[PDB]
Structure formats: structure tokens, C-alpha cells
Design an enzyme around this catalytic site. Structure first.
Site: not given
Ligand SMILES: *[C@@H]1O[C@H](CO)[C@@H](O[C@@H]2O[C@H](CO)[C@@H](O[C@@H]3O[C@H](CO[C@H]4O[C@H](CO)[C@@H](O)[C@H](O[C@H]5O[C@H](CO)[C@@H](O)[C@H](O)[C@@H]5O[C@H]5O[C@H](CO)[C@@H](O)[C@H](O)[C@@H]5O)[C@@H]4O)[C@@H](O)[C@H](O)[C@@H]3O)[C@H](O)[C@H]2NC(C)=O)[C@H](O)[C@H]1NC(C)=O
Ligand SMILES: C[C@H](NC(=O)CCc1nc2cccnc2n1Cc1ccc(OC(F)(F)F)cc1)c1ccc(Cl)cc1
Ligand SMILES: *[C@@H]1O[C@H](CO)[C@@H](O)[C@H](O)[C@H]1NC(C)=O
Ligand SMILES: [Ca+2]
Ligand SMILES: [K+]
Ligand code: NA
Ligand SMILES: [Zn+2]
Length: 805
Positions: A159, A261, A265, A309, A685, A687, A689, A691, A693
Site C-alpha cells: 500500500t 484489504d 487478508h 493493489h 546500465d 549504475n 538507474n 537510464l 549510461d
């Protein structure tokens, strides 16, 4: 210090920022124990409940009452939501027929239609199937408005990560709320759902909607609600805020429920007991809609019904224990359950060896119900690595299972059973984890179904609905224009930054000393005066335009009979390679005389080319090809597939996957989809991230060379959504699936890899499915620039994920 002795009389759930010395009467004063002394007895008025009855009509205007059924209440703003139905003969909203809302019908003083978000916790998509029979208000919203069959949550499917994603358009790794629990090694502190630490702003990154609003001068109601404020009071307080004067009324409002939720559960998602809580949520929706009707706002407000979810069947009988794999579970901390995160019990412990731990957790049981990953090896679609609060070691848990540290952590009751039957948190492509989205109101479309989409996309739309400019986020603005009747965002193609060169023959075969050998030759090719000109190559192999390069670099477009490529002079390999395979294409072998063949490419200088010597000297690294020789159109055309400009570095372990993809799967896809167009290439990639390199970030090269080693390989496979037209002659919408495959030295991820590739490679690929957009971030390329489709349709296509669920 606050003076508690003050009063809340005629102040309950006021909005203004009240500051200490003055006592508070707002949504969150309880959380801070800073309420005026009478708040509890006055603002939590519970007496007579939340609905009028026939006998209360006319009503002597009593002030102990939770809500009012007095003759004046439509004046004194305080009516029970059903007052008009019971006392003035009007109908409930749900009993009125759906009527298209073509433009807002708003009272005088309203300048924009308000937005009300009705968020529900653990509302799994398939609960919508329990329809009008159990949830008629919600079913009216869903069928009269705009709905998706489901909405994809972010990983972890818990959540806190997901509500904050809804609010910010950001991945958890970016907004910082990476779990319901976390440890931040810089704060040396732990965040939990319970307690006070969560109230500290230091944890919360990004810019959520209520702040984006406030900074742009648009008033927001509070999105947070103390747990002791009952559901009905939250609704009545929204309705009262909507009645505030013009200079005080908010434009955006949010309601949150903890249900279904909690029931999920306790009982599981299919438990017969789930019915009553769904009915109660529906009742609450109807209270809102009735209250909007009493206010003449039901054709003025845009209403979003959304969940955070889903929910899965999970019991204690289905728990794995790390103590069955590891010798000392007492030296580590585990964030347990439907995901695992491991760290040393003592931070920075020198004795902590994650490599030995991973090894002991890897493929130890034939039906093992979790899998260990270093976070950088997690599927890229999860975007779950680039934050210091995400532990290096992660356990992806199989649906319906838990992981725990040791048996003492599970509490089987006298029963033999545990109290719980439902959980969530699993991989976000798991079906049971999907949730809901409905939009209803003047700005949304009428009776419209839209494809499933990711929750990261909503922030931009809420912004659009409020006239706001979104803060930078991970949504693709314009991908959800198709939800709206107006307020659409007009997106603009990003500008190409580097333009390609089109080299002809600049070199002799004798200029090259690459250490490469080719023990065969197509002599007919040197008589082809048009060899490697554009010809019909682009028409056939580059069906949606060349990808634009959106960073500064030097690259070459290379044409061949069977494929086109964008060859980087900086990374010494293609950025992309594009080709089209017909339904009827024939697969062929690599002739014996060509097995080890690599040819220099007379269009590209020796100095911008790979060399075979580097590969001969790398004891770990081999090579593969991006356009596969297996799919050559003719024996003659096969020789281009051996060009050094088609070669990429590949571990033997990866070649097992790549050869099977190229030799078997591409044709399979072409058979089933009536031709496919494939674009393949490398990703760097290092690192993690998400994105592309820059060169400084690349950390591995083929021994003694400047040839960089990709972290992954992508492929994008496109065809006609209408498969009765071939991929290359498609008049309408497109169909896509894509992959970002990890480039690893071993197949330890694939438990069955000692077997033939037809037993494990596809299962591997399905796990590493990806959006075109994910690849765009990772490569700095922009695809589908020349199509007959609208730009908004293409953005939708680029945000699609083929899930194999
Ligand atoms: C999903 O979308 C986001 C949003 O656009 C992209 O994330 C952005 O990436 C860029 C490029 O790397 C980063 O730009 C850099 O910004 C820094 C200055 O950064 C500070 O100021 C900004 C703006 O006010 C702020 O957003 C930053 O927030 C980060 O740091 C906070 C701690 O101070 C933390 O609370 C917050 O949650 C956030 O952390 C995340 O980003 C950092 C890197 O900034 C990362 O280390 C961390 O683990 C989290 O992921 C920060 O205070 C400049 O100095 C650089 O030159 C550069 O401009 C943006 O900062 C970053 N913004 C955010 C909100 O994350 C994602 O790339 C995109 N993902 C994909 C896969 O597309
Ligand atoms: C106990 C109280 N709970 C609530 O306020 C419930 C609403 C809520 N829980 C959140 C948890 C993480 C992030 N935001 C939370 N919110 C606010 C909220 C955020 C988003 C939202 O969905 C949407 F954005 F409107 F679509 C609806 C409500 C609470 C108090 C303090 C803090 Cl720090 C967190 C929760
Ligand atoms: C790995 O398991 C072996 C027993 O199979 C054991 O000797 C070793 O201590 C274990 N290592 C860790 C880190 O759990
Ligand atoms: Ca990177
Ligand atoms: K080698
Ligand atoms: Na294996
Ligand atoms: Zn839950």
C-alpha cells in the site's frame, strides 16, 4: 505546546493550517494529539448513525446527531446523505439512468470541475466481476464512465509504495517509499506503517499531487485521514468542503478506505465473507454520489475510483524458511513475506558475504518458491534498484507463498491454521495483484473501455483534470489521452539530437588488420554496383521510421538486403538493428565454412571497428550477431550477417539464450503474428538507474580493448494487431512485445538451464518482458516516429507490457 482548552465548536475538520499555540480540529490533529479538548466528543459525533429514517423527517434540529434530517439542513450544510431520498421523495443516484455528461454542469462560482478520488485498498480487479448484484453504485460508475479491465500497480505491490506512486507518477525507487517498511542507512532509522517515524518528511521524495496543486495556486483537500475518523465522516466532510465559499473551496479531494484489504487478508480474495465488505464500500460510494446529487454536483465533478493493489491466496502452510538454506540466519535481517530483502543484522558488517548467501539460496529445491537476485539483476520492468533503501539482496517470491527467516516466525494456532488467508506484495505482473480504475464525469469519456495501464500514468491525468503542469515523473504524458473527452495534453515528438552519416565504401579490404578470418567469399557481391544502397531495404526492414537518437554521438546508417542498422562509432556496435521476417520465411543453418567467419565492413574505418583479437584474448567473452545469419533471405545475402558491424560481445551463457531466440523464436513469432519486425540492440546500465549510461559509467570491456560490454540486450517485436495483414502491409493499430534480457556470465537465474533451451529460455524471456518506453530510457532512442497512427496512440503502444499472464 498547544492550548488544548480551546474549542472545536463550529470548526470540525476545518482546512486552514492552524499553528501551535492554537489547538487543532483537522484530519490529522489526532495523530499529533494536538486536538482541542472537545474534538473527540464533538467532531466524532456518532449518535443515530449515518442515515435518515422516515420518522426523523421534520426533525427538531438536535446537535448530538451524527448528521441532520432537520427542515433546514440543506441550508445548515449538515444533512445525512440520504436526507432527500427519505424525506423529500427524491431517488438515490444509483437508481437514475446513466446520462452522458458532455460538458460540466456546475453551480455558479465553480470555475473548473472538481476532482474527487475514491481510493480503496486491496481492491483486486476481478472483484468488479461480482457486479451490480453486490456493488451497484460502483457498477454504474464503471459502465457509464470510462474503465480499464485492470490497472497495474508498482512493485512492491503493497500500500505505501503504491499510494505514493499514485500521488507522484513516480517509481518507488524515485519517490523513496520503497516498502511499507524500510531502513535508510544514512538516517540510521527505520520507517514503519505504524508509529511516528513515517510522519517525518525526510522519507517522502518527489512532488505529490496535493503539493503540485498548492504550488500552482489550486486548493487541495487533505489526502491523509487519521485512522479514528470513520468512513462516513470522511464522506460528509468532503461534502461539507464542497459547500465552502468560493474563496475557500478546494478543487481536489480524496477519500481513502482500508477496505477491502483487511477482509482480504483475513479471508482471502475468494472467501465468501468478502461480500459484506464490498457491499459496505459500495454503500459508501452511494453516499458520496447521493451527497453530490443533493448538492447539484453530480454532473459537475470528475470522480476517480481507484485501488492500490490486488490480493492473493496466501497461508502459513506455504512458507519457505531461510534457515533451511543458511547456516546463520541470526546474523541477517530479513524483510519477510511476499518479498524478501536481506541485510546484515549489524550494518556494514565485514563478515557479511552476500555471494556465499546467494549461492546457498540458488536452485536448491526443484519446486523452490522464491528466487534470489542482486537488485541490479532484477527484471528491468520492476524499476526496483536505484535507491539506497533497497537492499542489494532481494528475494522474488512465488505467488501464493511467503518467505520467512526461521520457523519460530510463523505462529500456527491450535487449529493447525494461521489467522490469515490473503496477502500481496508480489511481482506486479502477477494477475492477482492487479487493481481497478474507473473515471466518471464531464472530463472522462462516456461508456468507454480503455486498455489496462500502469498506475504511474495517473498523476499526469489528474494534473490534466485540474489544469496543472505535472512535476517530472515516470508517466508518459499523452499515453492516457484516450481516457478523456477534453483537457487532453498535446504531446510533441522529442527532437533528434544526432543525425546519422550514410557512409559508402571508404576502404579496401587491405586497410583492415582486425585479426578476423573468413574462410569463404561471395564473389557475386563485388559485381553488385548497388550493394548496400538504400534500395527497398528501408521500405521492407524499417517499417516505422528510423529511431531518433536523442543524445550527442557519432553514428552511421548501414543498409543491407535483410536488415538495416544504426552503427555507433563511439561504442563500436549497433545502437539498433532492424529487420522484417515474413510468415513464410525459411530458417537455414550457418554453413561449416562460415562458422567462425567475421568480415570487415568497408564502409566503416578500421579505427571504428571491433577486432577479433580482443575476443580471442578474452577468456570469458564470446560474440554473437544482432541480425541472425539463420534468417538470411538467400545464401548470397547471408554474407552480410557476418560483418564486423553486426557483431556484439556475448558471454557463452548468454549465447545459449540468444541463439535460441534468433534461430527458433523469431520465426515462431513470425508464424503466429503473420510476419514480425524486429529491432534489437545493446543496453548499458552499469549504475542500475534505468537510464542510458554515458561512457564514464561503463565498467567492463572486452579484454584489452575499448569494446564495451552491454548489461543487457533488447528486442522489440512488432506486427499488425489485425494479423490478417502481414507486418509489412499493416493499415491499422500495431501489436508489440519487447524484452530486456540480462547479459550475465551464467544461467544461475534459470533453474532448468542444464536442459535443452526449449525447456527454459522462453520462461526466462517472459520474466524479462518490457515496455518500449523502458528501452527508450535505457538507450536514448525514440521509436515509431513515422507511422500512420496518432502520436497519442503510439505513446500508448510504447507503454504496453506483454505480460504472459
Ligand atoms: C523517473 O522519473 C524521475 C523524475 O524525473 C527521474 O528521476 C530524476 O532523474 C534525474 C536524472 O538522474 C535526476 O536529476 C538530477 O537532479 C540532481 C538534483 O536532485 C535533487 O533535486 C531534485 C529536484 O528538486 C529532487 O527531485 C531530487 O530528489 C532525489 O533525492 C532526494 C534526496 O534529496 C530523495 O528524497 C528523492 O526521493 C530523490 O531520490 C531519487 O533520485 C536521486 C537522484 O536525484 C537518486 O539518487 C535516489 O536514489 C532516488 O532515486 C534531489 O533532491 C542534479 O544535481 C543532477 O544534475 C540531475 O539533474 C532527478 O533528481 C531525479 N528526480 C527524482 C525525483 O528522482 C527518473 O530518472 C525516472 N526514471 C526512469 C527510469 O525514467
Ligand atoms: C494513517 C494515515 N493514513 C492515511 O492518511 C490514508 C491515506 C494515505 N495513506 C498513504 C500512504 C502512503 C502515501 N499516501 C497515503 N495516503 C494519502 C493518499 C495518497 C494517494 C491517494 O491516491 C490518489 F493519489 F489520490 F490516487 C490517496 C490517499 C497516515 C498518516 C500519516 C502518514 Cl505519513 C501516512 C498515513
Ligand atoms: C552454505 O551451506 C553450507 C552447507 O550446505 C554451509 O557449510 C555454509 O555454512 C552455508 N553458508 C551460508 C553463508 O549460509
Ligand atoms: Ca544508467
Ligand atoms: K573468447
Ligand atoms: Na542454471
Ligand atoms: Zn494488505
Amino acid at each position: 505546546w498547544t492550548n488544548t482548552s480551546g474549542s472545536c465548536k463550529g470548526r470540525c475538520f476545518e482546512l486552514q493550517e492552524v499553528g501551535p499555540p492554537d489547538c487543532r480540529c483537522d484530519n490529522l490533529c489526532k495523530s499529533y494529539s494536538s486536538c482541542c479538548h472537545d474534538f473527540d466528543e464533538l467532531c466524532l459525533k456518532t449518535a443515530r448513525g449515518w442515515e435518515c429514517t422516515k420518522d426523523r423527517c421534520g426533525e427538531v434540529r438536535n446537535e448530538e446527531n451524527a448528521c441532520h434530517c432537520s427542515e433546514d439542513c440543506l441550508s445548515r450544510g449538515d444533512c445525512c446523505t440520504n436526507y432527500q431520498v427519505v424525506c423529500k421523495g427524491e431517488s438515490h443516484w444509483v437508481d437514475d439512468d446513466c446520462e452522458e455528461i458532455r460538458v460540466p454542469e456546475c453551480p455558479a462560482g465553480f470555475v473548473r470541475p472538481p476532482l474527487i478520488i475514491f481510493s480503496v485498498d486491496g481492491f483486486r480487479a476481478s472483484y468488479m466481476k461480482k457486479g451490480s448484484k453486490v456493488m451497484p453504485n460502483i457498477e454504474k460508475l464503471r459502465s457509464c464512465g470510462t474503465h480499464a479491465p485492470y490497472m497495474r500497480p508498482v512493485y512492491p505491490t503493497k500500500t505505501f509504495p503504491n499510494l505514493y506512486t499514485l500521488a507522484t507518477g513516480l517509481y518507488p525507487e524515485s519517490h523513496g517509499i520503497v516498502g511499507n517498511s524500510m531502513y535508510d542507512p544514512v538516517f540510521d532509522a527505520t520507517f514503519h506503517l505504524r508509529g511516528r517515524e513515517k510522519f517525518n518528511h525526510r522519507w517522502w521524495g518527489g512532488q505529490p499531487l496535493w503539493i503540485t496543486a498548492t504550488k500552482q495556486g489550486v486548493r487541495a483537500g487533505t489526502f491523509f485521514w487519521s485512522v479514528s475518523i470513520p468512513h462516513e465522516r470522511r464522506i460528509l466532510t468532503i461534502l461539507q468542503w464542497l459547500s465552502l465559499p468560493d474563496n475557500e473551496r478546494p478543487s481536489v479531494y480524496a477519500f481513502y478506505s482500508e477496505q477491502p484489504d483487511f477482509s482480504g487478508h483475513k479471508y482471502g480474495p475468494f472467501g465468501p465473507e468478502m461480500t459484506n465488505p464490498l457491499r459496505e464500500i459500495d454503500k459508501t460510494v452511494g453516499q458520496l454520489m447521493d451527497g453530490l446529487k443533493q448538492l447539484k454536483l453530480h454532473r459537475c465533478v470528475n470522480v476517480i475510483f481507484v485501488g492500490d493493489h490486488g490480493m492473493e491466496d496466501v497461508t502459513c502452510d506455504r512458507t519457505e524458511f531461510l534457515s533451511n538454506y543458511l547456516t546463520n540466519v541470526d546474523d541477517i535481517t530479513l524483510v519477510p513475506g511476499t518479498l524478501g530483502r536481506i541485510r546484515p543484522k549489524i550494518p556494514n558488517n565485514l563478515k557479511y558475504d552476500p555471494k556465499a548467501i546467494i549461492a546457498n539460496l540458488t536452485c536448491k529445491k526443484p519446486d523452490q518458491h522464491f528466487k534470489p537476485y542482486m537488485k541490479q539483476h532484477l527484471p528491468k520492468r520492476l524499476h526496483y534498484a536505484n535507491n539506497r533503501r533497497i537492499e542489494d539482496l532481494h528475494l522474488l517470491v512465488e505467488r501464493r507463498w511467503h518467505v520467512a527467516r526461521k520457523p519460530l516466525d510463523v505462529y500456527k494456532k491450535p487449529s493447525g491454521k494461521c489467522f490469515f488467508q490473503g496477502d500481496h506484495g508480489f511481482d506486479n505482473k502477477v494477475n492477482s495483484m492487479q487493481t481497478v480504475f474507473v473515471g466518471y464525469g464531464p472530463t472522462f469519456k462516456y461508456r468507454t473501455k480503455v486498455p489496462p495501464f500502469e498506475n504511474i500514468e495517473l498523476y499526469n491525468v489528474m494534473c490534466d483534470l485540474l489544469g496543472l503542469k505535472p512535476a517530472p515523473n515516470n508517466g508518459t504524458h499523452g499515453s492516457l489521452n484516450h481516457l478523456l473527452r477534453t483537457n487532453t495534453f498535446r504531446p510533441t515528438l522529442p527532437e533528434e539530437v544526432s543525425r546519422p552519416n550514410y557512409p559508402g565504401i571508404m576502404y579496401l579490404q587491405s586497410d583492415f588488420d582486425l585479426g578476423c578470418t573468413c574462410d569463404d567469399k561471395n564473389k557475386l557481391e563485388e559485381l553488385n554496383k548497388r550493394l548496400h544502397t538504400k534500395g527497398s531495404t528501408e521500405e521492407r526492414h524499417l517499417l516505422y521510421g528510423r529511431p531518433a537518437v536523442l543524445y550527442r554521438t557519432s553514428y552511421d546508417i548501414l543498409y543491407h538486403t535483410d536488415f538495416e542498422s544504426g552503427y555507433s562509432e563511439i561504442f563500436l556496435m549497433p545502437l539498433w538493428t532492424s529487420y522484417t521476417i515474413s510468415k513464410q520465411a525459411e530458417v537455414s543453418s550457418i554453413p561449416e565454412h562460415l562458422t567462425n567467419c567475421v568480415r570487415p565492413d568497408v564502409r566503416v574505418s578500421p579505427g571504428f571497428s571491433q577486432n577479433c583479437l580482443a575476443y580471442k584474448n578474452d577468456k570469458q567473452m564470446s560474440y554473437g550477431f544482432l541480425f541472425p545469419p539463420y534468417l538470411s533471405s538467400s545464401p548470397e545475402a547471408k554474407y552480410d550477417a557476418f560483418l564486423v558491424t553486426n557483431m556484439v560481445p556475448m558471454y557463452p551463457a548468454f549465447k545459449r539464450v540468444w541463439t535460441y531466440f534468433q534461430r527458433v523464436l523469431v520465426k515462431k513469432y513470425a508464424s503466429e503474428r503473420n510476419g514480425v519486425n524486429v529491432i534489437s540492440g545493446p543496453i548499458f546500465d552499469y549504475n542500475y538507474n534505468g537510464l542510458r549510461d554515458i561512457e564514464d559509467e561503463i565498467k567492463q570491456y572486452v579484454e584489452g580493448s575499448s569494446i564495451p560490454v552491454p548489461t543487457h540486450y533488447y528486442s522489440i517485436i512488432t506486427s499488425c494487431l489485425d494479423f490478417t495483414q502481414p507486418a509489412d502491409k499493416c493499415d491499422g493499430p500495431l501489436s508489440v512485445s519487447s524484452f530486456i534480457l540480462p547479459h550475465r556470465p551464467d544461467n544461475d537465474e534459470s533453474c532448468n538451464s542444464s536442459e535443452d533451451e526449449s525447456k527454459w529460455v522462453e520462461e526466462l524471456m517472459k520474466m524479462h518482458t518490457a515496455r518500449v518506453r523502458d528501452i527508450e530510457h535505457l538507450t536514448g532512442l525514440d521509436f515509431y516516429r513515422k507511422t500512420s497512427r496518432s502520436y497519442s496512440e503510439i505513446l500508448t503502444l510504447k507503454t504496453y507490457l506483454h505480460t504472459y499472464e
